[PDB]
Design a protein around this ligand. Structure first.
Ligand SMILES: C[C@](N)(Cc1c[nH]c2ccccc12)C(=O)O
Ligand SMILES: C[C@](N)(Cc1c[nH]c2ccccc12)C(=O)O
Ligand SMILES: C[C@](N)(Cc1c[nH]c2ccccc12)C(=O)O
Ligand SMILES: C[C@](N)(Cc1c[nH]c2ccccc12)C(=O)O
Lengths: 310, 318, 313, 305
C-alpha cells in the first residue's frame, strides 16, 4: 500500500479552507489556526479509541481475567502520554500574536460556534459531571453509556480482602485505628482531638452518602473501601498493577485539567476556572489520609494477595 | 461557521482505514500508527506553508524592504517551534511495543512503499543536496539556501571602497597573530611553552585559511561548502556586528537557520531510531547551513574586531 | 581548572541532609524532594542573575543606546526558556506518590517554614504588587528598588512618535477612529438591528481607549499598572512593529508577556503539587492592548518621518 | 525547619565563583555555564541515589521477594523521567551563543558522577575520586545483577515448562509449512534470510562467540529468560518484570540521547554504548504470535513468591 493512500492523505491534506481567503483577503496566520485544531482533533480521536477500548474491557467483564491488566494500564498510560503532548502543542499557538489573530477574527464563528464535539465526548466518557443530527445522537450515547468512572467503581467493589467474612479490611482498619488512638492518647492534646476527628470520619458511611449527594464525592462507599485496600497493600503482587491503574486515573485527571487551563488562557489571550472538575477526586482524597504505616492491618497466610484469577 | 465544518472534520476524522481490519482481524495498535503519521503530515503542511511564504518574500525581492525582517524571522522561529514538537511527538510511538507492531506489520507496505512526499519536498525546499511533478518543482525552484545566499552577498559593509570589512579583518588578524606569536616566544623554555607553540601553528592555520578564496572555491566543488565566498563574508559581518541595530534582526535569522538545521537532523535521528526499534537493526553532510555553524567556530578575540565609527550604515535602514 | 573545583561541587554535592534519616528512620523518596527544590533554587538564582542584569541596563540608562536591545531581548528570552524547563521539572515530583510523601511529612516544617526567598525576590523584581535577618534586608531592597515594570514604564514614555508637536500618534489615532466610525455608521444607515447594536458596542470599546480619567481610576483599583503615556507608547510599538526601529522593542514587549504567562503557569503547577501532597499579571496592559480590534486601514500612515528607520546611541 | 536551612541553601546558593570575574573582567554568560552544570550534577546525584538503591535490592537478594517489584520498576521509571529532563535542559545552553562563550573560554572538563553512573549501569580524577571510581568498576553493575535474576526466570527449566525446547520445535515446524506455502521470487529470497535469523537464536555457540567479541552482554540463560518474559508478558507473574525490561531499554535510549546532545553542544561551542543491546535484540525477532508455545492454566504464571 502507497504511503499517501494508506494514510488517506487525499482527505487529510485537502481539508484546509482558509475562511479569510474565501470571504475576502487571505490572512497567512489563519492556516496555523486550522492545522493546530485539526491536529488536536486527530489526537482526540486516538484518545477516544484508547478510552473506548479500555471501557469495553471493563463493561464486557474482561477485566476479571487479570491477564488483561497490563493491556488496560498500558493503554491508560498512552492516554496520559498523548495528553502530555497536547499541553505542549499550545506552544505552537503562542507563535501567533493576538494582533495577527485579530486580522482573521472577523471571518470566524462566535465563542458558541467554536466548540469541540470530540472533547465533549471524551469528558462524558471519562465521567465529568454535568451539534445536531448524528453528532447529537453520538453525544446522547456518551451520556447514556457507562462512564469510565462507573466501570472502575463497579470493579473497585469486587476488590479482594473487602469481604467481612473473609479478610474484613474495613473492620480490621477501624479496630486498629481505634486502638492506636487509645494508646496514642495515653501520654499535643489539641492536635490529637483534631487528628482523631479526621481519621474516624473515614468510617462514617452516612457522611460519605451526604457528600456524594452534594457532588463532592463520586465513588460508592464499597468502591472507596476497595481503592484504599489497593493503596495500602500496593506492594502485594496482586495489587501492584491495579495500583498503577489508580495512579494513571489520577494522572489523566491532572492532565485533563491542565489542558482545560491552557485552552482557557489561550481564549483569554486571543479574545480578551474549575476545581471540582476531577472525576477521580476520591483517589486523590484517599492519598491524603495520614494513617501511620504501623497501624495498617498485617497480612496473614491468605493466598489472595499472591494468587491471580482468569 | 460550525467548528467541525470550518475545520472540515468530515475529511480529517473520516480518513482512518485500518488495513488489518480491512484484510482480516483488526489490530488495535494500528490506529496509533495511522494517527501519528497523519499528525506528522499535518505539521509538515504547516512547515511547508511557513517555508514557502518566507521563500516567496526572498524570491520576489520583498526582503529588500527591511520592514519584512520581523515577518521572516517570526515565521522561521515558528518552523523551529513546530519542529521541536515533532521531535516530542515520537514519545507517542514509544507507547507501542515492537511486539505489538509485528501484529499489524503483515498488512503493511515495505520500507520503499512507506516514504513521505511532504518531508522530501521540505528537505528540497530548505536545500538538502502529480506527486512526481510537484517533487520536480521542489528540486527545480530556488531553495531557501540559494535565496539566503543571494541576500547575504548584498550585506552592507562588505564593499572595499566603503567599509572594507574583509581588508580590515585580515589586517587585524595578521597583526594580532604576530603579537601573539611574539608573546609565545617570550615565554621561558617550558612544557606548556612547547604545547603553546604547537597549538599556535594550528590556530594560525585555521584563522588565516578564512582569507583563502581559492581554498573555499575548491571546498564548494567537493560538496564541503554551500555558500559563496561573498555570502560567507556577509554572514561574518552580521556575526561580528550583531549588536549594531541594522544587524540585530538578521542575526536572529541566521541563528534560526542553524536551529532549524539542528532540529531537522534530530528529527531524522529519532525517526531512524524508531525504524530500527520496530524493524530491527548525526550526519554533517545533511546540514544545509554548515557555513553558519562554521563561522561560529572560528574564535576571533573581540578586541581584534575592526572598530565602527558612528558615521556609518549600521543605523540607517532601507 | 578541575571540573568539580570550578563548579564548587564540594558545596553543591554535600548539601543533602535527609531530615527523616537525621530524626529517625530514613525515607528514600525524601532525597528527591531535597534535590528537586535545590535544582529549582539554582534556576531561580540564574533567573535573578538575568533579570537583575536587564534591570541594570534600564536603570543605568544603557537602554537609550539601542545597540543593547539585542542583549536585553536575548536575556529576556533566556528567562522564558529557563521558566519553560521549571514547569517541565514538575514531572519529576509526579514520580513520587502522595502515599510515600506522607512517610517523611512528619519530619518537615509547616506551610510557613516552607517558602522560597528567591522566588519572592523574583516576583518583587518583576513587579508583582518567615524570613529574618539578612534575608529580611534583601527582601526589603527588592520591594524598595525599581521593579522591571517601573523601568519598562519609564522607557515606554520616551517612545518616538508620541510627541504632540511631532508625529502626535494619540491625536492622529483618535481622529482616525472617530472619522472611520462616522463612515461605518453611514454605511449601516441604509432588519440590520444586529449591525446597529454591534456598532454601538464597537464604538464604546475603541473610544474607551482615549478616556485618560478612566485609566487613572483603573490604576487606583489595581486593574492597570502602566501610566497613560507608557500605555500610549506600548500601542505605538504594537502598530508600527514592522518599522525597523520598533522590530526588536516589539519582541521585548512580546517576551514580557510570555514571562508573565510562565510565572503564572509555574505558580499553578506548584499549587497543584501542594494540594496533591497535602490535600498576578504585572504586564496586564500589554495583554490588554493586544485585544483592541482596530482595523488596520485606520492606523495612521507613515510618511517621510525619519524616526522609524534611524536609530539612537 | 526553615526552607533554606532544610535545603542547605547556604552551600548551594554560595558555590558560584565566576572564574572570569576572579581572573579579571566578569563575563555575564559564564554564570549560565556554572548553573547549568551544577543543575546537571544535582540530577546525576539523584540518578545515582535511585540506581544504587535498585542495585542494592538486587545484590541483597530482595528481588526474590516479588513484593519489591513495584519499588524496582517505579524507581527505574523515575530514572528515565529525570533523564528526559536532562535532555530538555540542553535548551538552556542553546540560549548562549558560541560567540559569547568565547569571551569566557580563556578563563577555562569531565564529570565524575556521569562516569560513576555509566559504570554502575554497566557501560564496558585522583584521591577520593579515584577510590570512588575504582568501587564503581569493581562492584556488580546493574547489567550483572539483572543478568543473574533473568537466569532464575520461571518456565526455563527443561524438566518443567521447557520454553526453549517448545519454542525451537514450533519455529522449526512453522518455517517448514511457510517454505511449502511459498513453493506454489522475492518471497523465496526473504524466506532464506528470515529463516537464518530465527534459527540463529538456538545457536548457543554463536552467542558465546559474540559475547567474547563484545557484541553481546547477557548470558545464554539470561537471554532465554528475557524472551520468556517477552512472550508471556500478559501472564500476571511477568506483567511487572516486562515493565522492568522495557524501562532498562528506555534508560539506554535516553543515556545515548544525552551523550548525543552533549557532543553536539561541544562541537557547537568549540550501538556499542547500549548495555541492554540484548533486550533491543530480542524485540527484533519477528516471531508470529501463533507460533508462541501455549500455556496450560495448571502452571507458575499466576502464583507469586
Ligand atoms: C477477578 C477480579 N479481577 C478481582 C478483582 C476485583 N477488583 C480488584 C482489584 C484488584 C485486584 C483484583 C480485583 C474481578 O472481580 O474482576
Ligand atoms: C536593502 C537590503 N535589505 C540590504 C541587505 C542585504 N543583505 C543584508 C544583510 C543584513 C542587513 C541588510 C542587508 C538588500 O540589499 O536586500
Ligand atoms: C533612545 C531611546 N531608546 C528611544 C526610545 C524610548 N522608548 C522607545 C521605544 C522603542 C524605540 C525607541 C525608544 C530612549 O529614549 O530610551
Ligand atoms: C523468586 C524469584 N523472584 C523468581 C524470579 C527470578 N527471576 C524472575 C524473572 C521474572 C519473574 C520472576 C523471577 C527469584 O528467584 O528471584
Amino acid at each position: 500500500l502507497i504511503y499517501g493512500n494508506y494514510l488517506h492523505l487525499e482527505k487529510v491534506l485537502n481539508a484546509q479552507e482558509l475562511q479569510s481567503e474565501t470571504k475576502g483577503n487571505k490572512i497567512h496566520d489563519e492556516h496555523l489556526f486550522i492545522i493546530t485544531h485539526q491536529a488536536y482533533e486527530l489526537w482526540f480521536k486516538q484518545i477516544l479509541w484508547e478510552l473506548d477500548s479500555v471501557r469495553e474491557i471493563f463493561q464486557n467483564g474482561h477485566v476479571r481475567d487479570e491477564r488483561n491488566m497490563l493491556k488496560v494500564v498500558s493503554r491508560m498510560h498512552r492516554v496520559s502520554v498523548i495528553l502530555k503532548l497536547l499541553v505542549q502543542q499550545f506552544s505552537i499557538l503562542e507563535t501567533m500574536t493576538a494582533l495577527d489573530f485579530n486580522d482573521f477574527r472577523e471571518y470566524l464563528s462566535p465563542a458558541s460556534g467554536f466548540q469541540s464535539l470530540q472533547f465533549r465526548l471524551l469528558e462524558n466518557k471519562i465521567g465529568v459531571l454535568q451539534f445536531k443530527g448524528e453528532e447529537n445522537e453520538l453525544l446522547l450515547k456518551s451520556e447514556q453509556e457507562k462512564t469510565l468512572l462507573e466501570l472502575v467503581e463497579a470493579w473497585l467493589e469486587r476488590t479482594p480482602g473487602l469481604e467481612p467474612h473473609g479478610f474484613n479490611f474495613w473492620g480490621k482498619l477501624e479496630k486498629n485505628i481505634t486502638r492506636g488512638l487509645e494508646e496514642e492518647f495515653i501520654r499535643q492534646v489539641a492536635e490529637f482531638q483534631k487528628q482523631k476527628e479526621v481519621l474516624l470520619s473515614l468510617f462514617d458511611e452516612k457522611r460519605h452518602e451526604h457528600l456524594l449527594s452534594k457532588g463532592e464525592r463520586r465513588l460508592s462507599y464499597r468502591a472507596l473501601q476497595g481503592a484504599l485496600m489497593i493503596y495500602f497493600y500496593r506492594e502485594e503482587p496482586r495489587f501492584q498493577v491495579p495500583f498503577q491503574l489508580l495512579t494513571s486515573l489520577m494522572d489523566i485527571d491532572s492532565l485533563m485539567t491542565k489542558w482545560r487551563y491552557n485552552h482557557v488562557c489561550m481564549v483569554h489571550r486571543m479574545l480578551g476556572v474549575s476545581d471540582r472538575y476531577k472525576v477521580f477526586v476520591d483517589l486523590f482524597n484517599l492519598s491524603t489520609y495520614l494513617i501511620p504505616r504501623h497501624w495498617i492491618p498485617k497480612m496473614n497466610p491468605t493466598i489472595h494477595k499472591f494468587l491471580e484469577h482468569h
